[PDB]
Design an enzyme around this catalytic site. Structure first.
Site, short mmCIF file in Angstrom:
data_model
loop_
_atom_site.label_atom_id
_atom_site.label_comp_id
_atom_site.label_asym_id
_atom_site.label_seq_id
_atom_site.Cartn_x
_atom_site.Cartn_y
_atom_site.Cartn_z
N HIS A 94 4.99 6.92 -0.81
CA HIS A 94 5.86 5.77 -0.97
C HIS A 94 5.13 4.46 -0.74
O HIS A 94 4.00 4.45 -0.24
CB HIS A 94 7.00 5.88 0.03
CG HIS A 94 6.57 5.65 1.44
ND1 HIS A 94 6.02 6.66 2.22
CD2 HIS A 94 6.54 4.53 2.20
CE1 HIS A 94 5.71 6.16 3.41
NE2 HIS A 94 6.01 4.88 3.42
N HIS A 123 0.80 -1.23 0.00
CA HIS A 123 0.00 0.00 0.00
C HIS A 123 0.83 1.27 0.00
O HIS A 123 2.01 1.28 0.35
CB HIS A 123 -0.93 0.01 1.21
CG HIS A 123 -0.22 0.21 2.51
ND1 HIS A 123 0.19 -0.85 3.29
CD2 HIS A 123 0.15 1.33 3.16
CE1 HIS A 123 0.79 -0.38 4.38
NE2 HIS A 123 0.78 0.94 4.32
#
Length: 209
Positions: A140, A61
């Site tokens: 990120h 994720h």
């Protein structure tokens, strides 16, 4: 409210990026440049897949807003946004432009689109009050952490890398791995810039723990 909101990769996209991460770690650990810097990394060739022993087990994720079930400041306000209501459960395509390694974490740099930045929270792209990194800089995907390291460090490591470069100290190109050019940033830090950006499919949703 959730623990956090974010974009959660499909099974296929998660597997693709995980594999790209693993190949990067394998090649970097075997690269002459990395071997020269081993005592700046771990004070004996090092298996980095093993080093980064805490890894996401399946779905990867890209977090937007940490909510802490409503206890994180601004969580409720973030959750209530019309743009979030319109985006919830919808599929997005995120662009990954680089992978990185530090002594604490490894992950992927996500470069969000203008539309996707509508779901990006305020006050997350700073390490100090006077920082002026672009909105979305922290975005990120964590791929692994050293044993004593919390996963939140991955975003902080990326911000530090991006701060170093914005401040005028960019990485030295030291070679080429699969997928792109390898840069030495000093102090145990390494970045692979992808020749072809990776696109991953992901669903915007909340994670409850």
């Amino acid at each position: 409210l959730p623990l956090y909101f974010g974009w959660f990769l499909t099974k296929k996209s998660s597997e693709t990026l995980r594999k790209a991460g693993q190949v990067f770690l394998e090649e970097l650990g075997n690269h002459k440049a990395f071997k020269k810097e081993l005592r700046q990394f771990v004070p004996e060739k090092m298996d980095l897949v093993t080093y980064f022993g805490k890894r996401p087990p399946g779905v990867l994720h890209c977090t937007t807003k940490f909510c802490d079930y409503g206890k994180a400041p601004g969580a409720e306000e973030y959750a209530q946004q019309d743009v979030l209501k319109k985006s919830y459960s919808k599929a997005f395509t995120l662009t990954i432009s680089a992978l990185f390694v530090t002594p604490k974490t490894t992950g992927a740099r996500v470069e969000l689109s203008e539309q996707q930045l509508q779901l990006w929270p305020s006050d997350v792209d700073k390490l100090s009050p006077t920082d002026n990194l672009p909105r979305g800089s922290r975005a990120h995907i964590t791929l692994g952490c050293a044993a004593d390291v919390e996963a939140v460090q991955t975003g902080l490591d990326l911000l530090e890398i991006l701060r170093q470069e914005k401040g005028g100290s960019r990485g030295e190109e030291v070679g080429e791995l699969s997928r792109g050019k390898l840069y030495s940033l000093g102090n145990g830090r390494w970045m692979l810039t992808l020749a072809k950006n990776m696109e991953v499919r992901a669903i915007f949703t909340g994670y409850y723990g």
